[PDB]
Amino acid sequence: ITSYAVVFDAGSTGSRVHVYHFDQNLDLLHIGKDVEFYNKIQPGLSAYADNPEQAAKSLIPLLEQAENVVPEDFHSKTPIRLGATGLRLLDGDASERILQAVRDMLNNKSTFNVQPDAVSIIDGTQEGSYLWVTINYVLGNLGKRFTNTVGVIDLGGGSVQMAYAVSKKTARNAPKEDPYIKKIVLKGKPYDLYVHSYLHFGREASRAEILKVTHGSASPCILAGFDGIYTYSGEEFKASAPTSGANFDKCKKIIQKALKLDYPCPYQNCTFGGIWNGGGGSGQKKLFAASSFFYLPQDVGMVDPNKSNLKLRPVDLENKAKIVCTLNVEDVKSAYPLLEKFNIVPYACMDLIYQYELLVDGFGLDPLQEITAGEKIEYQEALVDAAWALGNAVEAVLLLPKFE
Numbered sequence: 001i002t003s004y005a006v007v008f009d010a011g012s013t014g015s016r017v018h019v020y021h022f023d024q025n026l027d028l029l030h031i032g033k034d035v036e037f038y039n040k041i042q043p044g045l046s047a048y049a050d051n052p053e054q055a056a057k058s059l060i061p062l063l064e065q066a067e068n069v070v071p072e073d074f075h076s077k078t079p080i081r082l083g084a085t086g087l088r089l090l091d092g093d094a095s096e097r098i099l100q101a102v103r104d105m106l107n108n109k110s111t112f113n114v115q116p117d118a119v120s121i122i123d124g125t126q127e128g129s130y131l132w133v134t135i136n137y138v139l140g141n142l143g144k145r146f147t148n149t150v151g152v153i154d155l156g157g158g159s160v161q162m163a164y165a166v167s168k169k170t171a172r173n174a175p176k177e178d179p180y181i182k183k184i185v186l187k188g189k190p191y192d193l194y195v196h197s198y199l200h201f202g203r204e205a206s207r208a209e210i211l212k213v214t215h216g217s218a219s220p221c222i223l224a225g226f227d228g229i230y231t232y233s234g235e236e237f238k239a240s241a242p243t244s245g246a247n248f249d250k251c252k253k254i255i256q257k258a259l260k261l262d263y264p265c266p267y268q269n270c271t272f273g274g275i276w277n278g279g280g281g282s283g284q285k286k287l288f289a290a291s292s293f294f295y296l297p298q299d300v301g302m303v304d305p306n307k308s309n310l311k312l313r314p315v316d317l318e319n320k321a322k323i324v325c326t327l328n329v330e331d332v333k334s335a336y337p338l339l340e341k342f343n344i345v346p347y348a349c350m351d352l353i354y355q356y357e358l359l360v361d362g363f364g365l366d367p368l369q370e371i372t373a374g375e376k377i378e379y380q381e382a383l384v385d386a387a388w389a390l391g392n393a394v395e396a397v398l399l400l401p402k403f404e
């Protein structure tokens with residue numbers, strides 16, 4: 001009558017296990033006091049790049065816990081999956097050896113149902129599409145017409161993803177690299193998901209794009225009182241404020257350049273960089289913005305304490321940057337200790353204007369349109385990570401006979 005699912009998320013600095021218990025209607029059942037069992041170990045699979053057998057072994061305590069959580073009679077029919085990030089940055093084919101060692105370990109050490117596609121790297125558009133499933137699952141939209149689903153935007157470190165449901169018309173029309181449409185059937189309803197991952201335009205990566213605009217020169221995107229170097233992907237970028245410090249107007253123009261808003265559009269309409277926007281529409285009217293779209297507001301005191309998401313309009317980011325872009329590093333460090341925790345005080349103005357620009361100029365959102373940003377989303381009384389794991393589990397369970 002019910003089904004479990006076990007999902008590993010092998011991130012860059014640790015590995016996490018999620019176990020879910022779905023009832024007959026695909027609603028999550030509590031496990032203890034949460035809507036999942038969750039645990040984490042460190043370090044991540046990357047720490048064992050040189051020893052793949054040990055990378056897989058790192059996960060064994062988590063697996064054992066998952067084995068104890070799922071009652072033994074269900075084990076045979078319970079899917080287990082592992083999604084890895086990052087891990088691609090590994091030299092030679094250390095990436096693939098690790099994934100294979102994981103497969104071997106799951107096959108040797110567990111009783112769970114390991115499918116051929118169980119262990120993989122979750123790219124870019126795959127992540128965006130799983131996040132779309134997580135969010136629309138949590139909100140009870142699966143099986144509804146595409147127009148009642150909530151599109152997702154995820155500002156990762158390296159990339160930003162946009163995922164939202166479209167018409168079969170729009171899908172069929174889609175331009176002929178990651179394909180722009182991902183077909184997924186959820187609760188028996190086929191969806192055509194517009195999906196795109198923008199490499200270089202994640203939170204960390206975007207700073208490098210921005211600083212490239214000014215080459216060896218000071219940048220007005222940098223706060224007064226920092227004159228340093230930004231390192232991204234082993235490249236150094238000069239990051240020094242001009243004499244007058246940061247400046248919202250000039251930083252914004254630099255950001256507009258960095259985004260390649262003016263890149264010619266080979267299709268009907270584009271976001272930026274010549275990328276097709278997927279045509280917009282009802283599927284993109286309600287949005288949930290994940291990861292750094294939440295972290296930044298949280299770090300500049302926009303979010304109520306003890307909260308994992310918030311409603312905001314993009315104008316809120318612009319208005320925040322208008323103040324923050326007048327401040328220096330000491331001012332911002334004192335105002336916003338979380339930026340100091342994360343070592344990104346100098347980039348406060350840049351980060352805000354970037355998010356405002358990306359949303360409005362880039363993705364064509366109305367600056368007054370409310371969106372939800374969060375790292376977690378409410379499900380019953382609990383919070384679910386606004387990430388790919390749950391969506392991955394949902395998809396896995398939906399392949400079972402019965403769940404349909």
Ligand SMILES: Nc1ncnc2[nH]cnc12
Pocket residue numbers: 295296298299338342
């Ligand atoms: N508030 C935060 N800022 C930056 N990175 C994070 N990762 C998790 N929480 C974060």
